[PDB]
Amino acid sequence: SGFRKMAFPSGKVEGCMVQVTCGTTTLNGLWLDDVVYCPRHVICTSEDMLNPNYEDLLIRKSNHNFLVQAGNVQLRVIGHSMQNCVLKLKVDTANPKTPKYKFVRIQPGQTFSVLACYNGSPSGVYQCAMRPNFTIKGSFLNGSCGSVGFNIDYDCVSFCYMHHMELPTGVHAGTDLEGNFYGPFVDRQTAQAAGTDTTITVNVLAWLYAAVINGDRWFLNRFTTTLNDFNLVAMKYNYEPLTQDHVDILGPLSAQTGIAVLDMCASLKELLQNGMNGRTILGSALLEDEFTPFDVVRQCSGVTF
């Protein structure tokens, strides 16, 4: 019993965190095998940031300009290349602690663990979701650039995010491990704003199913709804449209609890209309959208209470 926001054990990722220095800038890098991955803006000055020509700035750099530190040891850079917004520094030593890994690009609504680092030293781990507006609501200070987001499903570490910058609203933007940003963002100081955010409907529904599994049924009602009628209501509360894929994905949870997906949608519609009324669902006074259907089946039991 019990439901918590849980992160993946950060051990396999901690053994990869290094400190990357180029001139005055210092941020984090991910040392996998003989390559260190870090944001390409490490080559930039604060002045360069408005309209930087990265290809022009990188052609001016030599391997000895990049100082890489792995613990108390200095790694020797023997090559460098750029892949989209990530800088790949070839090093002379392969990481002996390199885990089994994959570079994966995630879709909005997907969750992951963030190992926040400063000076190549991990300071904390937290769980978070890729928002529909492609931003992440993280907890980052200056020096955290290069911190990575991952999932450790089964035994392989799937790197899905690398931190790059904080937007004016306090939310964060970054790339997959191939250097492609999530969202319409650029690694530039130009006026960039996060688009209006929405609630991940499929995740709130999964979390309502987890509440039913933990014995909380107070929000359930005798109504059902059409998918179209639920989306018309949900749109007005700034909720993401629920698609037929989302419904299919909630199938296992529907079967386990005995509550049809469109039956749970009717409970959600009612919760949106009435509010919590002094009550909580899984110790929360708000509808939680940072647990995917997969997370709920992973954390929750099989014998419903």
Ligand X SMILES: CN(C)c1ccc2c(NC(=O)Cc3cccc(Cl)c3)cncc2c1
Minimum gap (Å) between residue 1 Cβ and ligand X: 6
Residue 292 contact partner, candidates a copy of itself, ligand X, Cl ion, none, CB within 5 to 8 A by sort of partner: none
Residue 291 CA to residue 305 CA, distance in Å, equals 19
Q: Does 238 bind a copy of itself (CB under 8 A)?
A: no
Exactly one of 30, 70, 89, 116 binds a copy of itself (CB under 8 A); that residue is 116
Gap between the Cα atoms of 250 and 268, Å rounded: 14
What is the C-alpha separation between 171 and 114, in angstroms, rounded? Answer: 14
Q: Which is nearer to a copy of itself, 156 or 285 (CB)?
A: 285
* 165 near ligand X, rule: CB under 6 A: yes
Binding partner of 285, given Cl ion, ligand X, a copy of itself, none, CB within 5-8 angstroms per partner class: a copy of itself
Cβ atoms of residues 172 and 163 within 8 Å: yes
Q: Token pair for residue 167?
A: 């937007």
Rounded distance between C-alpha atoms, residue 58 and residue 178, angstroms: 18
140 binds ligand X (CB under 6 A): yes
**Quick one: CA dihedral 71, 74, 79, 85, positive or negative?**
positive
Q: How far is CA 142 from CA 29, 119, 154, in A?
A: 15, 10, 33
Shortest distance, CB of residue 86 to Cl ion, whole angstroms? 19
- Put the strands of the sheet holding 73-75 in their side by side order: 73-75, 66-70, 17-22, 25-32, 35-39, 86-91, 77-83
Q: Does 41 participate in catalysis according to the annotation?
A: yes
Please report, as residue ranges, which positions from 178 to 197 form the binding site for ligand X (by CB under 6 A): 187, 189
Q: What is the per-residue DSSP string for 183-207?
A: SS--SSSS---PPPP-B-HHHHHHH
Which residues within the stretch 165-224 sit at the binding site for a copy of itself (CB under 8 A)? 166, 170-172, 214-215
x/- letters, 77..106, toward Cl ion (CB under 5 A)? -----------------------------x
Please report whether residue 49 would count as binding ligand X according to CB under 6 A.
Answer: yes
- With CB under 8 A as the rule, give the number of residues binding a copy of itself: 52
Q: How far is the CB of 179 from ligand X (least distance, A)?
A: 12
Count the Cβ atoms, other than its own, within 10 Å of residue 32. 19
Which region among 86-94, 124-132, 138-146, 275-283 touches ligand X (by CB under 6 A)? 138-146
Picked from a copy of itself, Cl ion, ligand X, none, the partner binding residue 107 (CB below 5 to 8 A depending on kind) is Cl ion
The catalytically annotated residue of 41, 163, 172, 246 is 41
Stretch of residues binding a copy of itself (CB under 8 A), selected from 64-72, 177-185, 252-260, 276-284: 276-284
Sign of CA dihedral 137, 139, 141, 145: negative
The smaller minimum CB distance to Cl ion, of residues 1 and 107, is found at 107
SS3 54: helix
Site for a copy of itself in 118-137 (CB under 8 A): 118-119, 121-126, 128, 137
Q: How many CA within 13 A on the CB side of residue 108?
A: 17
| CB 174 within 8 Å of CB 136 | yes
Known catalytic residues are 41, 145
**Interface ranges with a copy of itself (CB under 8 A):** 1-11, 14-15, 115-119, 121-126, 128, 137-141, 143-144, 166, 170-172, 214-215, 276, 280, 283-286, 298-305
**Interface ranges with ligand X (CB under 6 A):** 1, 41, 49, 140-142, 144-145, 164-166, 172, 187, 189
